[PDB]
Design an enzyme around this catalytic site. Structure first.
Site, PDB file in Angstrom:
ATOM      1  N   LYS A 163       0.826  -1.203   0.000  1.00 21.99           N
ATOM      2  CA  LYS A 163       0.000   0.000   0.000  1.00 21.99           C
ATOM      3  C   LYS A 163       0.861   1.254   0.000  1.00 21.99           C
ATOM      4  CE  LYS A 163      -2.446  -0.750   3.676  1.00 21.99           C
ATOM      5  NZ  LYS A 163      -1.699  -1.945   4.109  1.00 21.99           N
ATOM      6  N   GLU A 189       0.748   5.742  11.345  1.00 19.91           N
ATOM      7  CA  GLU A 189       1.706   4.930  10.615  1.00 19.91           C
ATOM      8  C   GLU A 189       3.098   5.122  11.209  1.00 19.91           C
ATOM      9  OE1 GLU A 189       1.516   2.603   8.673  1.00 19.91           O
ATOM     10  OE2 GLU A 189      -0.528   2.637   7.884  1.00 19.91           O
ATOM     11  N   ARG A 190       4.063   4.411  10.639  1.00 24.59           N
ATOM     12  CA  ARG A 190       5.422   4.451  11.151  1.00 24.59           C
ATOM     13  C   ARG A 190       6.025   5.833  10.958  1.00 24.59           C
ATOM     14  NH1 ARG A 190       3.911   0.168   8.701  1.00 24.59           N
ATOM     15  NH2 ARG A 190       4.417  -1.968   9.345  1.00 24.59           N
TER      16      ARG A 190
HETATM   17  N1  LIG Z   1       6.651  -2.789  -6.053  1.00 30.25           N
HETATM   18  C1  LIG Z   1       7.189  -3.631  -5.167  1.00 30.25           C
HETATM   19  N2  LIG Z   1       8.204  -4.425  -5.568  1.00 30.25           N
HETATM   20  C2  LIG Z   1       8.736  -5.281  -4.692  1.00 30.25           C
HETATM   21  N3  LIG Z   1       8.405  -5.484  -3.415  1.00 30.25           N
HETATM   22  C3  LIG Z   1       7.401  -4.684  -3.044  1.00 30.25           C
HETATM   23  C4  LIG Z   1       6.752  -3.750  -3.835  1.00 30.25           C
HETATM   24  N4  LIG Z   1       5.758  -3.104  -3.115  1.00 30.25           N
HETATM   25  C5  LIG Z   1       5.828  -3.654  -1.927  1.00 30.25           C
HETATM   26  N5  LIG Z   1       6.797  -4.617  -1.813  1.00 30.25           N
HETATM   27  C6  LIG Z   1       7.104  -5.412  -0.629  1.00 30.25           C
HETATM   28  O1  LIG Z   1       6.378  -4.877   0.462  1.00 30.25           O
HETATM   29  C7  LIG Z   1       7.267  -4.166   1.352  1.00 30.25           C
HETATM   30  C8  LIG Z   1       6.689  -2.809   1.664  1.00 30.25           C
HETATM   31  O2  LIG Z   1       5.363  -2.955   2.205  1.00 30.25           O
HETATM   32  P1  LIG Z   1       4.367  -1.697   2.252  1.00 30.25           P
HETATM   33  O3  LIG Z   1       4.401  -0.946   0.986  1.00 30.25           O
HETATM   34  O4  LIG Z   1       4.740  -0.889   3.491  1.00 30.25           O
HETATM   35  O5  LIG Z   1       2.930  -2.323   2.523  1.00 30.25           O
HETATM   36  P2  LIG Z   1       1.829  -1.993   3.628  1.00 30.25           P
HETATM   37  O6  LIG Z   1       1.893  -0.562   4.026  1.00 30.25           O
HETATM   38  O7  LIG Z   1       0.506  -2.392   2.980  1.00 30.25           O
HETATM   39  O8  LIG Z   1       2.135  -2.960   4.772  1.00 30.25           O
HETATM   40  C9  LIG Z   1       8.619  -4.130   0.647  1.00 30.25           C
HETATM   41  O9  LIG Z   1       9.692  -4.176   1.582  1.00 30.25           O
HETATM   42  C10 LIG Z   1       8.575  -5.387  -0.220  1.00 30.25           C
HETATM   43  O10 LIG Z   1       8.907  -6.548   0.534  1.00 30.25           O
HETATM   44 MG   LIG Z   2       2.339   1.051   4.935  1.00 27.33          MG
END
Ligand SMILES: Nc1ncnc2c1ncn2[C@@H]1O[C@H](COP(=O)(O)OP(=O)(O)O)[C@@H](O)[C@H]1O
Ligand SMILES: [Mg+2]
Ligand SMILES: Nc1ncnc2c1ncn2[C@@H]1O[C@H](COP(=O)(O)OP(=O)(O)OP(=O)(O)O)[C@@H](O)[C@H]1O
Ligand SMILES: Nc1ncnc2c1ncn2[C@@H]1O[C@H](COP(=O)(O)OP(=O)(O)OP(=O)(O)O)[C@@H](O)[C@H]1O
Ligand SMILES: [Mg+2]
Ligand SMILES: [Mg+2]
Lengths: 487, 365, 166, 523, 50, 46
Positions: A163, A189-190
């Site tokens: 996300k 969030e973080r």
């Molecule tokens: N476009 C992408 N390509 C590769 N890995 C991705 C990608 N988007 C997310 N990830 C994976 O998700 C992680 C980041 O999660 P995040 O974007 O914070 O999701 P959320 O906020 O929904 O938990 C990355 O470290 C990787 O492991």
């Molecule tokens: Mg996130």
């Protein structure tokens, strides 16, 4: 009892983040802001917001800071109105908190006007019909669930599905060249994620400290008490509303995460004497979210393109919070963990996404027809996948295997490397034009690329990148054959 | 010394189930204190209460160890000047006791040298042992996959009619009889007939020499007993084992059946005490109660206690808070499955869900 | 001269002369790190000069602390310090830094690390101080005479079942 | 000139580990979340924490010590200050309670501080070596990061964290104390024996000199179990605010929530999901937000968090488990099936993730990790759906991920590089660990007199920092690295594998089986 | 006790005009000595069982 | 199909019961925390 400015009261009860205040002259109006003037040896000021009236003199309130070192009978002074936040172009390039105080340590901010965070939503007559496609540079979004300018977008997803990454990609692709302004609201969030965003925006010159910036940041994060996380969204939304109405500009509004607004209110709901509803959310879940969401809209004066990230707890989209947010959006992007586990990013489930502008009247006929064909093929491919596990791929007819082979290419061709996830992927990102996406998928559906290897469509951009990757795959395969030949 | 509250007089103020409130004019005695009801009340047996909470400076809430039948308000109560104490020493060997420490074998008086309170503090960090060795039980599954540790803590999680009791008897026969040290059998919320069968078995094997020296003590508060007794019999049995471990430096075996009924009993009283229930309906203090009890069941630098506890899994739901919390308090975990038993396999141990701490090459071969 | 700015745009103190003097007055080289810690806390990031002084203190110091520390190595500390400087501070080590490392390798008798540092200076810098290259070779040939070219247990013949796997 | 305390009322009621106070008329009053002393004797006091301030004036108190001594009617004095505990280098190597009291074995920091601001942080760019190849490659951890360790009971949640603490012992002895990693191990609701066993284990490897233990055993009241994480991180924030790095381990947050639930319900707080209090997310949220990587302007110190969480039947849909997962920057999921299948540590790479990414990896590990990641991804899919190179090397990588003790960086990186460049293609999967053992603890080239390398030998432990600076794929180290691997492979295949494949005797077969299993537990 | 009470009264500025009164209370927790409480200021000069 | 249906119909029954129990527990907690104040009526007028 018209002007309550400076009215005095005393703290009567303190339980967690909820504080009861007694006024001899009558409790001020709800949503009013109060300051704890008493000297309690605190390192930070204490402010409260009235949420309820227990009687003509007592009022229940939520604190914005920690209630530590708070004693009973402590003196409290009304501020004469609701919580006010600065507005105007002077806030650009700056970071604020729920109370509208700068926390970037970059000096005083010159504010010519302040507005309350609580405002009435636009009425029916103040609604503008804007049906225009928004090009995000992403194959999946632009094709299956195209976004609309001035509309509302949701990114529903669990934890770790991507996300935040998608939001960063959207900022990099839509905000750098945006004509108007942008507002980013971090909610529960973080804190490190906010820091990384601030650095990236400064590097991309969106926030030009020496020059002119074009974005505002408002951060209320996990560390903050539930009172702050339940109002930071209102604060940022108020800034966007001012830019929409007074400045008449087209503004972007990014929110991450909107669920925390609901979560925070549920935490305080128990202490306000409200019986929990199903699952354990507050009974006012639907009404509170509706008031906020209706404010996030495009009116006849200006337009707000809203992108909101929704957390689906435990990947349960039947949960009250994710479901309640589906009816308040114009474009829903549903991310699935299974897709991500298969190496497909962004992990979008096109069979669960939807868009309001997916109509031939709004978008081109070719775009509509291509998208529908893709969805139908994916649906059929999933039914076949059940057969392919029971009977096996051999048993499938000639027509079915062609669907299988074409559909697998579609699944891998929807994947795309983002310019912000280079560290995660290790490859440069791509920005695919809307026309290129339509043409590439149109050719794939009718079999123009049936002879191309399947993996050539994996983590690439337009059709041109597919051909280049296939050529590279052919070259390396030839080298391996030559090495085997010498042996 | 003598307690400053002994002989203090109070009057019953409220009666609800096994929970009784007592008002003392001069001040409520300390928590955990024992009180005796003086009024005849036409009862067939005496009535004893244990204080568990303080409602105010004068009122105290207590749990009755016997049935509260024919109990009226304003009834007179007298403090005993201390907690519930039980006999200790070699005089208890070969005898049967109840929660209050009264012998129920209809034999001569115990004549114990002294008594010690059931409630006591646990061994501290510096008084913990570091000895790991294998206790050979003779059972193939246990000795291979989840070997037991001498002086350690062992749990047998199982449903109803799965084989928990049978394995305990097998362990008793294969270990306790050929054991140099002493043994303590704590029956908690279990069938009364099983206690009688065990007593006969221990007499036939001459582990209880009625005329000679015995090596086993029995403490029994069974299903028929009210919740107050079932929540304290384990404490009393453990207290006797603690004395043997420390005051004599003697190895002890502690067979507790069933420990789940202890938590169940505290749940029943907690409901009456006016406490908000936790998940399922258990008391909010489930973990703390087990922690205080289990931490006392340990091997110190003075002696060793090898404990085997039977855990009942309600409705065969291993995720129930009671059995779930007990896993962290056990060195060896033996999980029994009903389906395995229905397949004719006995014991019904499910090795995949079992564990042991001495499954380390540094300990075993 | 020119104001430096940090990651977020705030200015950093650049007058790092007093700290260098403090570093050049330490007895045990572990105390030097404390000075670097204080510099960072005071928003006075070390420059190339500061790191070189730290390396000098390491080479000239008797030991890490007043009391001996097991498995302490001057070479390891300096290499880690260089790693911090180049990677986490974006500063290229100069000839002086590598010379200090080579001197430590020669002084400690570690003649195999000297060969690697010798190539590093011949690759990044311009050659090596020929005084130190010769000293290292002398140490190596002393080992050949005395037979301490490799640990002896490695030279012992072994077999499939003649190896003790602890 | 008197030590005048501030009496605020009397003790009204006592319910287990919590109490209620009635204020005496016309008294100063007590402040929220402050510490109070219950006078159990004219010279002895019991500690309590203020939790509720009711309209009636009654005060909710969480007892912390000397509970058995508390009786109704006793006097209460108000210190008027929040909770402060000792902090400094003088606490290392000791066992303490959340209140700072030392537990015998056989500067004041505020426990309620706020987390660093957004502009007070810096991107995570410094690695924290756990010592396990699987984690260090596929699940990078960087200083200032929160990495959850989620799994079922008896899966290695505690062992991996303890190994991570131990793996810093060797590093800290060599590098300057500036970059040394201090450790705060917090035991919550655990058995007292386990704490002692951990204390002895740390002492054996000499980790107590850089580590301190904060224990709140099961026998202790819920209040201490509730404050242990906050006290532990406070001890670790002392080093963070002074340009040093720390590692805080919480074993485990699952039992902290139970204690908080117990306290809230007894003090008449409305229950929520699974009877937990409504503000149970905010409890952990403010605990883990205090772990950060401070900016250059504030010192550059950091706190790394490794909270541990337990599940039931591999159910990560629970309440507290989900909340913690939505807070941390990554998760290490230990799977029961893999643990029983012989894979140890049972790290499920598919379900595990690190959101920091390669930024938390050394330049030397970046290249190896990036290429290794692609091979495993293909290996997972190939088998799920033919001796292709990805499938040949994928199995060997998996075999190399079985460990019992943390591995030195030089040994781990070299072995991964060898398996990556096909040097183990001719080696059978069963013999990979034996091959690694000879590479690390032996030198075939010297044994057979075929070693022509000048400096690059596995017995020169000082090469770890040169590798960590230049990378393995650099001209300085690449040429000799390939030569050593080529010699080691040729010698190993010729002199060992040939004999191993020629064993048929039952005695010899059994002897080989013992050797290979031992090699798993050695390297 | 009276002397201590007067000293505490002098220290308190709010009670400058207030008249000092002494009220004795029996506490079984102290075997020897005495304690004085005035407007929240508590001074302990007592000992209990050893 | 007959064994996974029973566990699905047994699960829905347990889920309904637990959710309802939680709500009533909160209802009873908020009722218990509430206390009735002094009754300000003409008690003599009776
Ligand atoms: N476009 C992408 N390509 C590769 N890995 C991705 C990608 N988007 C997310 N990830 C994976 O998700 C992680 C980041 O999660 P995040 O974007 O914070 O999701 P959320 O906020 O929904 O938990 C990355 O470290 C990787 O492991
Ligand atoms: Mg996130
Ligand atoms: N080892 C065994 N071999 C053969 N049959 C066994 C064995 N263990 C148990 N059984 C059978 O299972 C029955 C129940 O065993 P047991 O008395 O141990 O139950 P339990 O686990 O104590 O359950 P509960 O005490 O709740 O009734 C026995 O009467 C016997 O028929
Ligand atoms: N890498 C490993 N290789 C082999 N055995 C291991 C490894 N890690 C742990 N073990 C062993 O597995 C068992 C469980 O380990 P550990 O104590 O870490 O589990 P845990 O996650 O803390 O479980 P719990 O605390 O709930 O008992 C122990 O016997 C331990 O020695
Ligand atoms: Mg039984
Ligand atoms: Mg553990």
């Amino acid at each position: 009892v018209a002007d309550h400015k400076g009215r005095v009261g005393h703290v009567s009860q303190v339980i967690g983040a909820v504080v009861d205040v007694h006024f001899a002259d009558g409790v001020p109006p709800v949503l009013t802001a109060l300051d704890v003037v008493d000297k309690l040896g605190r390192d930070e000021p204490l402010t409260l917001e009235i949420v309820q009236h227990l009687d003509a003199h007592t009022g229940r309130c939520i604190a914005m800071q920690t209630t530590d070192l708070l004693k009973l009978k402590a003196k409290v002074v009304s501020t004469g109105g609701n919580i006010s936040v600065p507005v105007g172009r002077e806030t650009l390039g700056r970071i604020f908190n729920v109370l509208g105080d700068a926390i970037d340590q970059r000096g005083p901010v010159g504010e010519k006007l302040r507005m309350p965070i609580h405002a009435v939503a636009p009425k029916l007559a103040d609604q503008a019909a804007e049906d225009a496609v928004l090009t995000t540079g992403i194959k999946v979004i632009d094709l299956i669930l195209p976004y609309c300018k001035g509309g509302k977008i949701g990114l529903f997803g669990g934890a770790g599905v991507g996300k935040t990454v998608i939001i960063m990609e959207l900022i990099n692709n839509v905000a750098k060249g945006h004509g108007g302004f942008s507002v980013f609201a971090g909610v529960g969030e973080r804190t490190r994620e906010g820091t990384d965003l601030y650095l990236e925006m400064m590097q991309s010159k969106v926030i030009d400290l020496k020059g002119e910036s074009k974005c505002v940041l408002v951060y209320g994060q996990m560390n903050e008490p539930p009172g702050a996380r339940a109002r930071v969204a209102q604060s940022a939304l108020t800034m966007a509303e001012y830019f929409r109405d007074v400045e008449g500009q087209d503004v972007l509004l990014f929110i991450d995460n909107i669920f925390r607004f609901t979560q925070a209110n549920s935490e305080v709901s128990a202490l306000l004497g409200r019986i929990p509803a199903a699952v354990g959310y507050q009974p006012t879940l639907a009404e509170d979210l509706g008031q906020l969401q209706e404010r996030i809209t495009s009116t006849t004066k200006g337009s707000i393109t809203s992108v909101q990230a929704v957390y689906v707890p435990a990947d349960d989209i039947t949960d009250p919070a994710p479901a309640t947010t589906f009816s308040h959006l114009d474009a829903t992007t549903v991310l699935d963990r299974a897709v991500a586990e298969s190496g497909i990013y962004p992990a979008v489930n096109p069979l669960e996404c939807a868009s309001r502008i997916m109509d031939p009247d709004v978008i081109s006929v070719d775009h509509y027809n291509v998208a529908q064909d893709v969805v139908q093929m994916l649906t059929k491919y999933r039914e076949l996948q059940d057969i392919i596990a029971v009977l096996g791929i051999d048993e499938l007819s000639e027509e079915d295997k062609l669907i299988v082979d074409r559909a697998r290419k579609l699944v891998k061709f929807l994947s795309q490397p983002f310019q912000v996830a280079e560290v995660f992927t290790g490859m440069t990102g791509h920005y695919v034009q809307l026309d290129d996406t339509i043409d590439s998928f149109s050719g794939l559906l009718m079999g123009t690329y049936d002879q191309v290897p399947e993996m050539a469509f994996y983590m690439v951009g337009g059709i041109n990148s597919v051909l280049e990757k296939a050529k590279k795959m052919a070259e390396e395969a030839a080298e391996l054959e030559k090495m085997r030949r010498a042996r | 010394p003598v307690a400053d509250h002994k002989g203090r007089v109070g009057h019953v103020s409220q009666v609800i189930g096994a929970v009784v409130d007592v008002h003392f004019a001069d001040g409520v005695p300390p928590v955990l204190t024992a009180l005796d009801v003086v009024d005849k009340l036409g009862r067939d047996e005496p009535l004893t209460l244990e204080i568990v909470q303080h409602l105010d400076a004068h009122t105290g809430r207590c749990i009755a160890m016997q049935t509260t039948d024919l109990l009226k308000l304003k009834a007179k109560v007298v403090s005993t000047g201390g907690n519930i104490s039980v006999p200790v020493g070699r005089e208890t060997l070969g005898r049967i006791f109840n929660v209050l420490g009264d012998a129920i074998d209809q034999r001569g008086p115990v004549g114990e040298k002294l008594r010690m309170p059931i409630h006591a503090v646990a061994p501290k960090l510096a008084d913990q042992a570091a000895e790991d060795a294998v206790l050979t039980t003779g059972i193939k599954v246990i000795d291979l996959i989840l070997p037991y540790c001498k002086g350690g803590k062992i749990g047998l999680f199982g449903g109803a009619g799965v084989g928990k009791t049978v394995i305990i008897m097998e362990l008793i026969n294969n270990v306790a009889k050929g054991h140099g040290g002493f043994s303590v059998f704590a029956g908690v919320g279990e069938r009364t007939r099983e206690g009688t069968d065990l007593y006969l078995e221990m007499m036939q094997s001459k582990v209880i020499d009625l005329k000679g020296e015995s090596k086993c003590v029995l403490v029994y508060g069974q299903m028929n007993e009210p919740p107050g007794a079932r929540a304290r019999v384990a404490q009393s049995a453990l207290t006797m084992a603690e004395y043997f471990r420390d005051v004599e430096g003697q190895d002890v075996l502690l067979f507790i059946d069933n420990i789940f009924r202890f938590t169940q009993a505290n749940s029943e009283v907690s409901a009456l005490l006016g406490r908000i229930p936790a998940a399922v309906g258990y008391q909010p203090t489930l973990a703390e109660d087990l922690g205080q009890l289990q931490e006392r069941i340990t091997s110190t630098t003075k002696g060793s206690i090898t404990s085997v506890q039977a855990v009942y899994v309600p409705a065969d739901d291993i995720t129930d808070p009671a059995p779930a919390t007990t896993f962290s308090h056990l060195d060896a975990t033996t999980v029994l499955d009903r389906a395995v038993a229905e397949s004719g396999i006995y014991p019904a141990v499910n090795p995949l869900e079992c564990a042991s701490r001495i499954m380390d090459p540094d300990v075993i071969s | 001269a020119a104001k430096k700015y940090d990651l977020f745009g705030y200015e950093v103190d650049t007058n790092t002369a007093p700290w260098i003097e403090k570093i050049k007055k330490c007895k045990y080289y572990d105390e030097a790190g404390e000075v670097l810690v204080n510099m960072n806390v005071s928003n006075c990031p070390p420059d190339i000069a500061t790191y070189n002084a730290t390396l000098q203190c390491i080479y000239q110091s008797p030991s890490k602390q007043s009391t001996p520390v097991d498995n302490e190595s001057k070479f390891c500390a300096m290499m880690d310090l260089l790693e911090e400087m180049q990677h986490r501070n974006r500063l290229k080590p100069n000839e002086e830094s590598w010379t200090w490392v080579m001197k430590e390798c020669v002084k400690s008798g570690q003649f195999r690390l000297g060969y690697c540092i010798q190539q590093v200076m011949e690759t990044e810098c311009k050659g090596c101080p020929a005084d130190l290259v010769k000293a290292n070779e002398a140490n190596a040939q002393k080992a050949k005479t005395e037979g301490k070219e490799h640990p002896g247990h490695l030279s012992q013949q072994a077999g499939l079942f003649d190896v003790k796997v602890e | 000139f008197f030590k005048t305390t501030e009496m605020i009322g009397y003790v009204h009621s006592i319910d287990g580990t919590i109490a209620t106070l009635i204020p005496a008329p016309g008294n100063p009053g007590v402040a929220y979340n402050t510490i109070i002393q219950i006078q159990v004797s004219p010279t002895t006091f019991a500690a309590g924490l203020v939790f509720n301030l009711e309209k009636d004036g009654r005060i909710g108190i969480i007892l912390m010590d000397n509970i058995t001594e508390v009786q109704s009617g006793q006097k209460v004095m108000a210190t008027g200050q929040l909770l402060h505990i000792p902090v400094g280098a003088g606490v290392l190597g000791k066992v303490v309670n959340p209140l700072g009291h030392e537990v015998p074995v056989g500067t004041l920091g505020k426990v309620d501080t706020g987390a660093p601001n957004i502009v007070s942080r810096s991107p995570v760019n410094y690695n924290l070596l756990t010592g396990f190849k699987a984690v260090d490659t596929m699940i990078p951890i960087g200083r200032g990061q929160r990495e959850l360790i989620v799994g079922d009971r008896q899966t290695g949640k505690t062992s991996i964290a303890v190994s991570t603490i131990i793996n810093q012992v060797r590093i800290n002895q060599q590098i300057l104390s500036k970059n040394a990693v201090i450790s705060i191990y917090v035991s919550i609701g655990q058995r007292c024996s386990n704490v002692a066993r951990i204390h002895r284990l740390l002492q054996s490897y000499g980790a107590l000199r850089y580590t301190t233990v904060m224990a709140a055993t099961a026998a202790e009241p819920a209040g201490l179990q509730y404050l242990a994480p906050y006290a532990g991180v406070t001890m670790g924030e002392y080093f963070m605010n002074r340009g040093r790095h720390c590692l805080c381990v919480y074993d485990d947050l699952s039992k902290q929530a139970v204690a908080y639930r117990q306290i809230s319900l007894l003090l008449r707080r409305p229950p929520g999901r699974e009877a937990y209090p409504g503000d149970v997310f905010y409890l952990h949220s403010r605990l883990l937000e205090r772990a950060a990587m401070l900016s250059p302007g504030k010192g550059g110190g950091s706190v790394t968090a490794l909270p541990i969480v337990e599940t039931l039947s591999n159910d990560v849909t629970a309440y507290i488990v989900t909340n913690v997962i939505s807070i941390t920057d990554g998760q290490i999921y230990l799977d029961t099936k893999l643990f029983t299948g012989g894979q140890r540590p049972a790290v499920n790479i598919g379900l595990s993730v690190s959101r920091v990414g390669s930024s938390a990896q050394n330049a030397a590990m970046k290249g190896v990790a990036g290429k290794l990641k692609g091979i495993l991804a293909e290996y997972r899919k190939l088998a799920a759906d033919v001796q292709t190179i990805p499938m040949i090397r994928g199995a060997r990588f998996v075999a190399l991920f079985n460990q019992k003790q943390p591995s030195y960086f030089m040994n781990a990186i070299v072995s991964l590089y060898a398996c990556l460049n096909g040097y183990l293609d001719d080696v059978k999967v069963q013999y990979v660990k034996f091959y690694e053992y000879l590479l690390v603890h032996r030198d075939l080239g010297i044994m057979y007199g075929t070693a022509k390398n000048k400096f690059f030998y596995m017995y020169v432990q000082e090469l770890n920092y040169l590798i960590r600076f230049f990378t393995l794929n650099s001209p300085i180290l690449h040429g000799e690295l390939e030569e050593m691997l080529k010699q080691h492979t040729h010698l190993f295949l010729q002199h060992y594998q040939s004999k191993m494949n020629a064993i048929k005797s039952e005695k010899d077969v059994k002897a080989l089986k013992n050797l290979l299993y031992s090699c798993k537990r050695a390297v | 006790a009276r002397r201590v009470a007067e000293e505490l009264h002098k220290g308190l500025k709010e009670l400058a005009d207030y008249t000092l009164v002494l009220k004795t209370v029996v506490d079984r927790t102290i075997v020897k000595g005495f304690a004085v409480e005035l407007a929240g200021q508590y001074v302990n000069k007592a000992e209990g069982q050893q | 199909q007959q064994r996974t249906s029973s566990l699905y119909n047994k699960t829905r029954q347990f889920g309904i019961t637990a959710a309802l129990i939680e709500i009533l527990s909160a209802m009873s907690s908020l009722e218990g925390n509430a206390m009735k104040g002094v009754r300000r009526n003409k008690f003599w007028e009776g």
